Amino acid sequence: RAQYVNQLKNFKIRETQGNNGWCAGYTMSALLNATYNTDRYNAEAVMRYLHPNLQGDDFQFTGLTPQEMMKYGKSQGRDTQYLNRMPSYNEVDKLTTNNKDIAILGSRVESTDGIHAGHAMAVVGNAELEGGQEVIMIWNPWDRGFMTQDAESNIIPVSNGDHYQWNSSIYGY
């Protein structure tokens, strides 16, 4: 379907997110595993590192702030940077070529509640489909595969039917 594909060369899906709030741990572990070419990172261990004192339900379900995500990157030797938007196709291409990882900070469009839940996902790279469409490839931690995201759209339709707006990004993992 694509005749240009640029992906982080060692990205692999090793674990998936079930009944927990560790999406940002999933995301950062997969990115850091890809860029360092390792398997030392995993969601639970990242969350334990950032939340050493939580146990029980609080440890199971408390996620990470952007600040915590940024501090984890820096702790692991990476010059991570906040981007208060979604990158362009071009920006993903360049980052990907440079073996730098991108974390997606999104929020749910749907809301029963008036609360719009936060979610973190990983960029895997970018491609040009036959016919010219520019797409960014995304790993939602829930999933055993990748989504193809129109690079002009900042709404990500996810595998349970929900929609997440790609609000911001942390690049440089």
Author numbering: 1 to 173
Relevant lines from the article:
The X-ray structure of ScpA2 shows the typical fold of the proteases belonging to the papain family. The domains are separated by a V-shaped cleft that contains the active site harboring the conserved catalytic triad (Cys23, His119, Asn140) residues.
Data quality assessment using Xtriage showed that the crystals were tetartohedrally twinned, suggesting a (pseudo)merohedral twinning with four twinned crystal domains. Applying the relevant twinning laws, we found that the crystals belonged to the space group P31 with unit cell parameters of a = b = 103.15 Å and c = 51.21 Å (α = β = 90°, γ = 120°). The final model of ScpA2 consists of a total of 519 amino acid residues (173 for each monomer), 413 water molecules and 5 chlorine ions. Cys23 forms a thiolate–imidazolium ion pair with His119 (3.5 Å). In ScpA2, the oxyanion hole is composed of two hydrogen bond donors: the Gln17 side chain, and the backbone NH of catalytic Cys23. This S2 pocket enables the processing of substrates with a hydrophobic side chain at the P2 site, consistent with the information available on the substrate preference of ScpA2.
